[PDB]
Symmetry: D2
Subunit: 466 residues, 4 copies
């Protein structure tokens, strides 16, 4: 059952509606890419949960007392203190958002292994249970190839597994041995594997992975956008921690990484914000190296592109986002949507933490991956009810930066991303109802093809036809 | 069907849960009166929709640019403009809230007819399709007796009627005759009869009523807390206006009153605010008389107890509260709750605008009105699921200020007041689920009796014990 | 010297200017009463410091997390806790503002002595070192005569005295003897005598006064609008407390009253808010009696006309308003204005806590009190520079509710009320410069007379001619 | 009245703390003699910079409350775009979190453009500006592009007055382009109010001439607009042909002489966070879509580019509020007041500019060689004395030659007392002046500085030094 909101709605933002005819015109005008649609032409925007959710009174209140100092802001220290208490990390660098931190640590870490272990940029490879679109982008832009070492169950939308976000431990080890440990600049642990469908990573898996990393002295970066939801799943599924608090599980979790890069725009519940933090003194050097690069890419390292109030707000969000009643509610809503879709015959990845992932591949078997079936489905859904979603399949995966050919994709998923505390059960029902029509028209949905394709992170602004 | 929210949630306030054992202790410490329970001991607070609902971004934004001047604030003029454009009234006096405006116009209007037509304070009577508790309170405190002239269908929870909030025209006229037109200081038209169950008043009824008032030259005050919902019902039920906008219907509606007193804390959607406005120059005198009394009771008449930002916020709320998609949604949610309760066998007044009114009388037939069955039901509901509600029956009606005996009551209703844009469909379902248990235990609920009773507006702070 | 602001300006509200011709037209349209002028027609609004000052970030932040519950709001408890820790009072009832609390306790206290000691309403008299216009108003409206028992030095603008707000102890005692202790419903101690010119009341004086009250068992109500400034003066002038903190002095001060009525719109620094609190159990009865009357006049006693956020904000203001650096600055600014005026030959009451009181009587000796010289001066000042002020003389004092004749007035003062943290030293200089012209035209300022006079609190909306 | 009275009422304040001399003594040492490393709470009056540290208006704070946090196509984006179209007349808008956010985008894009279109030679490319900001110069050099500031002879003569010291050296610009070869000049940056020159204005005539030269060689012109409003004000007070124009009109005119604008909204637009990268018209549509592609990588989707919805609504309002004439007159008059006060006590400064008083450390501390950063020494002295924090705009900031590796020659050693907008009062100005009385009295005893830790890029922000 969809749990009742453990909160009262305090502030609302009105939204309008549109006609089918209008959407038809609009979706064409947008080159068949929802990313290019106007906000006001969307009734229920499930494009992403990043910076689109609601905030709590405490957070809005925090936003009112920021120290806008350019250097040494007390708001910075407030944020730093929250990081020290929650993750146990001593060094903090705020960034405006996720890719803000990535564009800093990646270059820094690469140069490090180069200068220390003779890493060869022409043969370097980074690993992750699964890289973010932007993490992969910045890695490749820095001449580093990536390899996602996910488990066999990860993308089997027909089978259930407790931690589909887990690292393929053997795979990771053989991968490192092959590539050569000196050529692996870092390993990124994505807490709640986004591409796997917001699937959790067990604490045991993290310990094992970190153990392998320690062995080859490879820096481990914990991508923490949805650390809270991951902590929740660990608490519900990993026996050892059934009776631990989200805070305790989080603290434990972060003992298995050397630093964290986070897009606070998710679980921390803020409309803007990111973090780049190092656990301890052993990484003091990368810390000061990141402060140097931060000045260039984001701003002085005591605000790094965030206004004072934004840091006070984040200092609070990191806590509010860990509330157990909240997490149970949020995740239960997603479960509700997934079960609703599954009951009308729309197969999905098992319910994850932030969104329902519809298996476009299974729903539209006639359109080849090369033709982006999940993107076609997205346009169909929008047409139908004014709901906007994103594809997590071949369109997003991109082409091989070396071959120039379309990368093979493990699954063509349509992601119905649910912004935190933004929509109600009625909206969920509305979405499910919409899919009844989408399904009833599956067989007639046409594949898509480029008319304009950017060279980097193409899915955000590309346009397609047919 | 419960319509999907025509808005996105932007800011939330976390709430806490409790155990049955805890509530059991708490309801006792509160003297069996939910009004005395702590907010944090309530999961879903349906005590009232007054100042407890959500606001829109525009409103929260307006709150940020107020002119805190003590006199002639531009924020005051902003509010005045909204009133002129929406209601067509030229004179505006802000008050912190509803009873703030009542404590001003009532004394003023009474003195007026006294000096003008020789009204006899010892024999004066005021009329209304149905007085709010505070309106009745201030009237009686001023030595004026009240008489609610509602229609026969008003309190028949078993029959459906389009406008149960309507004035009993024949009754109003008869009443004015029996009492003597010189002794009737004013008539209050309560837009959406609260006690009737948030039932609407037709525009035709208002015209007729105002016509009668004009005949005897009796001032007509439009109590406007829920004017928007009333405008909505008119639009859905009164043929002549099916195609009018809420704004147009409102403008039309207010041509049939001489002034308005409003608790902005409802449809205007603000956590604080009230209004006392006069339509035109013919009432300029009561206007300046109200400015004089306002200085004493509320504050300088250009802010009357409201901070600058509060007036800017209200200037916006008056508009946002009239949005058609919004009104349809809000009222549809209430309908959903009422239908849900009715489906599990809990008879209610037909769905009104702001709340579901459960008929405690029908649900608990073994308890005499003198023992406040709706209050007993309220305590039962709280114990069961941590939901807080109010009774609109004998407990609230009070005693006859002259006889000193309990006033006879037309219905014992438990009001599940729904704050605007605060709870979801899931909460509604939660409430319905709770009532399944309440119903199952109906026959065992005891009646209540006083242990402490205030002399005025007793229901707010009184304490009772059972049986 | 004007101290430098111990704070940074964070939010500003733009204001406009006007022409002399325009003001001349406006002042007449307003019936020669500044109270009737539009805010936008005023450059520097010194009408009052009540609810017109600035707030701190913490306060604005508090306003964002209020519990709007109709009953038992946690915001109410927050306010109650602040009252308990600052004043040591156990019972709290919020009111929207000052006169909101007055209209409650006055009726309640009167009925009390009537039912307990046989008070005779037809012969009852209340005392105060000096009643506020609204306190006097509500008293008289309730059929109670008032008597201000101020000291001989109080209104001598030519002589300096440490505590001109003090009670005339002998006077108070004789007064009570004359009237009969059974007919005195209450004594109001106005912390910082407003009419005396924002002059302080010593702690010793309060002890003595409370001692007299205890003797006749007369309830003592501490009017606390400017309790903080009074605490400051005590700290600077009363030897015994030179080394005490504002918080400590306040706590001590409130041991000499049975309850407090406060317009939080002043020292607490909020744009809206008031308080009615009782010290302890011995007054539990008046407390529950006030809860009953509050439901009628203000709202449920757990919010009493204040929104949730307003109570959270006040809970913070009560503290922020007691900051020592702040108080020193605020009071130093007033001192600066007073010294500046005195330097150009404009005699004033010695610098008090919230405003400079110009002695209109001494500045315009040709105008008889009956003609309100301070009001004439106010209109002159406005015409000259667009500065708005209020008179604290015969116009405000009113007529004898019994005789119907104009009450005799101890001083005709023009009050240049300074809103807290709103204007700068440059504005002060601007005000002083304006007075150079006002003085240079003193001899030609005409007296005033009614054209419209309300029956109660006339000065707020009356209109005059000539 | 020289210090004009505030054309506004203070609505919200933030309390600040004081410290003891002994404490500052310890603190300045712990900070490696670099104020940038001091804690905010250890500063009474923070004149480090006016960037994102000033106050906002009610309208702005109100705007912050109604943002559309959509990830794409936010209506708040369109609101910002509309303001840009009305004010600057530019049709294409891309929001960025701040200044360097826009720089890291257009610089790479413009360079690749001339490379692919005119055969630019990265190994011989040079960019020009009346004067590059530290971050603009940084990103240029990081992209392998050398910079050349073509300022006028009067620019850094703190002893002489001149109406537009921020002007381009037209002959110099032309000679420079000829020397380097027009195909190797990727762009020209016009810094509206030359920051390094001392917040000195650039005349509209100078801009027309400069743009004319650029059009001739088909060189893209980027208008760095952080302080466009103050520049518009000076033009209105000093350039005869515009004495009677409004700030809005002068701004509109001004922007006809650039192809695009890069702006750190954290200054004149008055916001604590925000930036803009906009193109004038269709002729630059290509760089526009190229910037959208690079923005996705560096900042975020191009319809918010690192700014939350409310931040864009706030900026849409700030761009307007910042152009108010009474406001500008007041703000600039305050700076004039501080400059005249300092000059009164014998402390020579650059003639009053728009956002700060620039003390000439070189003239105040003649015994210290530029190599030893006299302006930085002066900054530490000022802090010790009264808890006032400032920045140096001299050799320390200028850096080393990325090619030679040697310290770059500097035209002036200035200590910048940056005044955040609507934050401090006249009393604070007087406080600052009073502080300098002591600083001056001790001038002869201030020692020079030297590195103990120096970053390879933008060193002045986090470097640490010690007394030589
Ligand atoms: K956002
Ligand atoms: K960046
Ligand atoms: K409220
Ligand atoms: K106010
Ligand atoms: K009242
Ligand atoms: K900032």
């Amino acid at each position: 059952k969809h749990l009742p909101e453990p909160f009262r709605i305090r502030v609302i933002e009105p939204v309008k509606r549109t006609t089918r005819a209008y959407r038809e015109e609009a979706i064409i005008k947008s080159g068949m890419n929802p990313f290019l649609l106007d906000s006001e032409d969307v009734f229920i925007d499930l494009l992403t949960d990043s910076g689109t959710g609601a905030v709590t009174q405490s957070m809005q209140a925090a936003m009112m007392r920021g120290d806008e100092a350019y250097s040494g802001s007390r708001s910075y220290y407030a944020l730093a203190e929250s990081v020290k208490n929650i993750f146990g990390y001593q060094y903090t660098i705020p960034t405006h958002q996720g890719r803000g931190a990535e564009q800093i640590y990646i270059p820094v870490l690469i140069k490090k292994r180069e200068q220390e272990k003779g890493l060869d940029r022409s043969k370097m490879v980074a690993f992750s249970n699964y890289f973010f679109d932007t993490t992969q982008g910045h890695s490749q832009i820095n001449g580093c190839t990536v390899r996602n070492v996910y488990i066999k169950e990860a993308f089997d939308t027909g089978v259930r597994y407790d931690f589909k976000g887990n690292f393929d431990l053997e795979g990771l080890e053989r991968g490192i041995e092959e590539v050569g440990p000196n050529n692996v600049p870092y390993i990124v642990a994505t807490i709640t594997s986004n591409s796997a469908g917001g699937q959790p990573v067990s604490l045991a898996n993290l310990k094992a992975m970190y153990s392998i990393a320690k062995k080859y002295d490879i820096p481990v970066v914990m991508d923490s956008a949805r650390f809270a939801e991951n902590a929740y799943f660990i608490k519900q599924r990993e026996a050892e921690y059934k009776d631990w608090t989200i805070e305790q599980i989080t603290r434990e979790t972060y003992k298995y990484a050397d630093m964290l890069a986070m897009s606070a725009k998710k679980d921390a519940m803020v409309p803007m914000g990111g973090l780049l933090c190092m656990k301890d003194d052993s990484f003091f050097d990368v810390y000061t190296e990141c402060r140097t690069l931060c000045v260039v890419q984001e701003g002085f390292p005591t605000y790094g592109g965030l206004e004072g109030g934004a840091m006070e707000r984040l200092a609070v969000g990191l806590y509010d986002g860990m509330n157990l009643d909240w997490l149970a509610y949020r995740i239960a809503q997603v479960q509700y949507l997934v079960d609703g879709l599954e009951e009308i015959g729309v197969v999905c990845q098992q319910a994850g933490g932030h969104a329902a992932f519809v298996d476009a591949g299974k729903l539209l078997p006639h359109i080849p991956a090369d033709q982006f079936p999940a993107q076609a489905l997205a346009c169909e859904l929008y047409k139908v009810a004014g709901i906007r979603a994103v594809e997590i399949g071949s369109f997003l995966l991109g082409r091989d930066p070396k071959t120039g050919k379309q990368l093979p994709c493990p699954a063509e998923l349509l992601r119905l991303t649910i912004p935190r505390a933004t929509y109600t059960q009625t909206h969920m029902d509305f979405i499910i109802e919409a899919f009844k029509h989408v399904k009833e028209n599956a067989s007639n949905i046409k594949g898509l093809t480029f008319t304009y394709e950017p060279k980097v992170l193409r899915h955000f602004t590309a346009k397609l036809k047919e």
